[PDB]
């Protein structure tokens, strides 16, 4: 990603689209109470409008752990297919 | 010439014309497909100790 991102709690997803996990947010003025329900568990925390903006401050930057390399595993996946 | 009234085809030539091919065992299909499906189990199960799923679609950590 870039250094500064400009998304979070504005035009956000307000509800889940599947039935496997149930999502509800409580759009208040400053903060928002999320209601997440996945299987037997439920989580209900509170996220500010400035709590999602600090989320993209440190980047995750996922990378693949391959046996030999990502190139080789993509050729071997094609030979397997 | 009593031997010319006997059947000229030998007892050997009956046994090599009647039992011409060694017949296929019933268990030969089991123990050849099981040893070949043990390689389908190994590579493609997700509980095998030597799965291909981590060297074919690597990971994302």
Cβ neighbours of A63 in B, within 8 Å: 60-61
Cα A28 to its chain centre, rounded Å, is 21
User: Which resolution in angstroms does this entry have?
Assistant: 3.0
Chain A residue with CA closest to B44: the answer is A80
Token duo for residue A70: 């990502």
Residue A21 pairs in a beta bridge with: A38
Q: Residue B52 belongs to what H/E stretch?
A: none
Token duo for residue B29: 């299909």
Q: How many CA atoms lie within 13 A of B61 on its CB side?
A: 6
Token duo for residue B20: 């011409």
Of B56, B60, B61, the CB nearest to A76: B56
Q: How many CA atoms lie within 13 A of A68 on its CB side?
A: 10
Q: Give the strands of the sheet with A21-27, arranged side by side.
A: A21-27, A31-38, A41-48
DSSP A61: -
- φ/ψ (deg, to 5) at A38: -130, 105
């Amino acid at each position: 990603l870039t250094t500064f991102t400009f998304s979070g709690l504005q035009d956000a997803p307000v509800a889940a689209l599947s039935g496997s996990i149930k999502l509800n947010v409580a759009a208040k003025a400053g903060k928002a109470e999320v209601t997440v329900a996945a299987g037997a568990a439920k989580a209900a925390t509170q996220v500010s409008a400035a709590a999602l903006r600090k989320l993209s401050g440190s980047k995750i930057s996922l990378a693949e752990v391959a046996r030999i390399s990502v190139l080789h595993s993509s050729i071997q996946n094609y030979l397997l297919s | 010439d009593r031997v010319l009234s006997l059947p000229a085809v030998s007892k050997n030539q009956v046994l090599e014309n009647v039992f011409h091919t060694a017949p296929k065992a019933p268990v030969e299909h089991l123990e050849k497909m099981v040893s070949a499906n043990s390689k389908v189990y190994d590579a493609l199960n997700l509980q095998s100790k030597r799965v291909l799923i981590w060297q074919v679609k690597p990971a994302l950590f």
